Every structure is written in C-alpha cells, then in structure tokens.
C-alpha cells in the first residue's frame, strides 16, 4: 500500500462486497448494506483493461522461426546462429519478466490511489456534518437514510440540510 490505504488504515477487504473493487458500507435505523461506486470502479476496469491490452499489443505475433543446419566445417556460422538465437531469447525473457513486475507494482499502487481519492471525495463532501471514526469509516452526528446514503455515494450530499442538526448534536 504505497498510499497507506490498502493493507494500511483500512486493514481488510469486504468479502461481502461482490459487485465492484471499491464502494460503500452503510448502517442506519433502516438497516445495513454494501454498494460499489460504479464510476471509480468502471474507470479502474477501463484503465487495467487498457494496460493488459497494451502489454499484449506490444508483444507482436512470432512468425515461423526454425533451426538451421551446418556441416562439419561451418562450426563458426553454427555458433554465430546460436549466439543470435540465445541472445534474442535472453533479452525477451528479461523484457517480459520486468514489464509484469513493474506494471504489477504500478497496478497495486493505482488501486491504493483510487481508494484514497474516493475516501477524500466523500470525507470532503460530508465535511464537519460527520466525524472520521477510524478504519475509513465516518460516524454521522445526524440521522442518515437510503435517500441520504444514495445522495452521498453518487456525490450529491447536502451540508445546509444537516448543518444546524449536526452542530446541536456535535457540542
């Protein structure tokens, strides 16, 4: 977790959340439930899908590549041919292995980025109308409902509506 979110201040994942990589858990008078943020999740899928496609597109089809034969008196050309085959293979193995390692690091860091950015977006939206209560959770100073929860998840949360009530409650 390069950005300290994944395997950081949010210690675990939610096995209960099966419909996307990132999203929300709500608990209110009416009950509790999970829901993926489709915008941030779908964009994350598009990016990763574009990155896999990029790796494959850049590795072009290998066409027919076969052994050559050399007589008792062509040991140098045989050796030269081997040096060329071995050399290319050394290079391609190395290129392939590092590219997956580098991109994997970049990938995990990318998911960590998406979690930090979504948390900050909701936190900055909710502002002082709720308190950060650890492990990426907010505890409301006011009553929240399905309408309230749906408005926050899709980035349409209102401060004036609950500003007075929270202030009375927060003391």
């Amino acid at each position: 977790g390069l950005f300290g979110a994944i395997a950081g201040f949010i210690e675990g994942g939610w096995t209960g959340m099966i419909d996307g990589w990132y999203g929300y858990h709500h608990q209110n008078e009416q009950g509790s439930g999970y829901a993926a943020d489709q915008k941030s999740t779908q964009n994350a899928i598009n990016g990763i899908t574009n990155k896999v496609n990029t790796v494959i597109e850049k590795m072009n089809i290998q066409f027919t590549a076969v052994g050559k034969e050399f007589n008792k008196l062509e040991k140098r050309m045989e050796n030269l041919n081997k040096k060329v085959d071995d050399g290319f293979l050394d290079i391609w193995t190395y290129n392939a292995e590092l590219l997956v390692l580098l991109e994997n690091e970049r990938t995990l860091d990318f998911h960590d980025s998406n979690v930090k950015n979504l948390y900050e977006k909701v936190k900055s939206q909710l502002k002082n109308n709720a308190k950060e209560i650890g492990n990426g959770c907010f505890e409301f100073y006011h009553k929240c409902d399905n309408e309230c929860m749906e408005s926050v998840r899709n980035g349409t949360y209102d401060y004036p509506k609950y500003s007075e009530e929270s202030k009375l409650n927060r003391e």
């Binding site: 007589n71 391609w92 994997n104 690091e105 979504l118 990426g136």
Partner: protein
C-alpha cells in the same frame, strides 16, 4: 449511524510477484504465459504437413528405396523429419551444399515429381540396371528411385550428351551423382575410359566433375564413394549432361512452387485430424496469449517463446479477507 468506504475481497488464491514483494495474493489476475499444447501434429491454416517418415530430406530427394514412396504431387505448410532419420544417403559420399538445399526447401510449398530423363529412351548404348547392397530394398540390392547408375554396355561407355528444357513454369530441382571407384580396375570395368569426366551446364550453373580413384575405408561395405549434386533450373532454361563415365544420371526431378511461413522441424509427435494457427515440435498451441514456454521452434502465428516459469499480471487488488 456510520458510513464506510472499503474495497473488494474474495476467495482468490492467485499469487503474483512485484518488484518490492512476492507471493502477493490478489483478488483478480490474468496469465500471459501459454504452457498448454495438444501434443499432436496438426494441419496449419487448412494445409497438412509433409511427413518424411523413415526418411530425411536426403533420403527423400534421392529416393532411398527403404522409404515408402510419397504421391507424385504434394503441398504442405511445413516439413516433418523424425528423430529416427534411419534412411538418408544409402551409398556413401558427400551431399554437396546439403544445408543450402534444406534452406531452399524451407520456402517450398509443393512439388511435382516427374520423369526428367525417361529410363528406356534417354540413355542409348549404356546399361541402366546398376544396383548396390548399400541401397538395399527387402533384402535385395537396389538403387535410388530418382537416379540411374549408367555403366558400360557390351564393353563400351559411349560419350553421352542429353539436355532437358524446363517448360513446367516452375523452378525444377535436378539432382545427380558422381561415382568414385576405389581402384583403376573397377573404373575400367564400369566406364572403360580411365580418364573420364562429367559436365553439367545451365545458363547460371557450370561444373565439371573428374573421378578421384583411391582405396578408402569401407562405409556400408563400399570402399567407393558417390557425391551428390543439385541445381534449380529456372523456368524456360535448359540443363545439359555430358559424360564419358561416372555419371549417376537424373531420372526423376521436382517442379517446385514457393510459399510463405514454412520450415523443417523434427518431431516425435503423430499427425491427427486437427487444425491450428501455431505448431511446435511438441504439439499445437491454441492461444491469444503473448508468451509461451512450450518450445522455441514455431510454425505459423505463435506466442513469443521465453524461458519463464510464470508470467502473471495483477488486475485486482491485494486480497485481504481478514
């Protein structure tokens, strides 16, 4: 009331490596390294390969009698020799520019085997019956199906001159041989002329052959030697043979068509009723994967061969069902 943001986990056991860490368990991932093949020789883009069976390019083109005779006309996507190259050169000597001819065949898509110099008509006043125990067939002494051992007839080897004009509209591969007796008595018996020569000429090929007489060590019971030569006769061009001895004359030759993406491979595997875009000596690959560790020898449109044991790229996140 409380509201929480968090991330997916599942039952995934998939592991990947990164630069900083390894054996990192992740929610979702994709394998990039193809390691699965079907262990069969298959048709390539609809076209079957050429299986030489108990024969090697040398045995096939000379027509070693021990090799089951192929059709007079064939097409292929690639050529298969077997590790058990049991029938090749049967009469000992050198196959001149053999490796270059194999490379030429790597870009050949079909052949017509045809009677370039008919046995009965082409060689008046010479014997054509010559056989040898080195080129055995069902225990009986025999000879190459595509060459003819010309020897003396009624104590004379008249100087011969024969030419063929290529009206096939394809390159014609002509092969022939030069026999080198072990001693001056055998030379006398077979060809009468102690100072014989052979000449072969085209528009772009010119070579004279003179026998070299010496007691050599026995190879397949022969102290004598036979050198094998070939050329590609261009469409419309003429090949001329002159000899007063020692010529192993062409009888059958091959009209060659050129194609793309072919080669010669050696394989233990069997032809099955299957079709592939990618063939290896071990078996066919059916894959949209970029890399493979099955075999470096490929026919068709294949993944790039690498030595890697695993190439797995993460798509999901660190899987922590805690």
């Amino acid at each position: 009331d409380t509201i929480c943001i968090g991330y997916h986990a599942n039952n995934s056991t998939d592991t990947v490596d990164t630069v900083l860490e390894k054996n990192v368990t992740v929610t979702h991932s994709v394998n990039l390294l193809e390691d699965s093949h079907n262990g069969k020789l298959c048709r390539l883009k609809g076209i079957a390969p050429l299986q030489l069976g108990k024969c090697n390019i040398a045995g096939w083109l000379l027509g070693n009698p021990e090799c089951d005779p192929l059709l007079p006309v064939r097409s292929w996507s690639y050529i298969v020799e077997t590790p058990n190259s049991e029938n090749g050169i049967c009469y000992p000597g050198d196959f001149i520019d053999y490796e270059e001819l194999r490379e030429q065949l790597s870009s050949v898509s079909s052949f017509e085997r045809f009677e370039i110099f008919p046995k009965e008509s082409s060689w008046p006043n010479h014997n054509t019956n010559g056989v040898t125990a080195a080129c055995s067939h069902e225990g009986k002494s025999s000879f190459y199906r595509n060459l003819l051992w010309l020897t003396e007839k009624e104590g004379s080897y008249p100087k011969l001159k024969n030419s063929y004009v290529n009206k096939k509209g394809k390159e014609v591969l002509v092969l022939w041989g030069i026999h080198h007796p072990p001693n001056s008595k055998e030379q006398q018996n077979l060809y009468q002329n102690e100072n014989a020569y052979v000449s072969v000429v085209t528009s772009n090929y010119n070579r004279r052959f003179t026998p070299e007489i010496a007691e050599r060590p026995k190879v397949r019971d022969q102290a004598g030697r036979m050198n094998y030569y070939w050329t590609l006769l261009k469409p419309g061009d003429t090949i001329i043979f002159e000899a007063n001895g020692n010529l192993i004359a062409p009888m059958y030759a091959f009209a060659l068509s050129r194609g793309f993406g072919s080669g010669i491979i050696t394989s233990n595997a069997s032809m099955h009723e299957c079709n592939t875009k990618c063939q290896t000596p071990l078996g066919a690959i059916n894959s949209s994967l970029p890399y493979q560790n099955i075999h470096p020898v490929t026919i068709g449109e294949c993944p790039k061969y690498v030595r890697s044991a695993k190439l797995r790229m993460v798509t999901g996140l660190r899987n922590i069902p805690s």
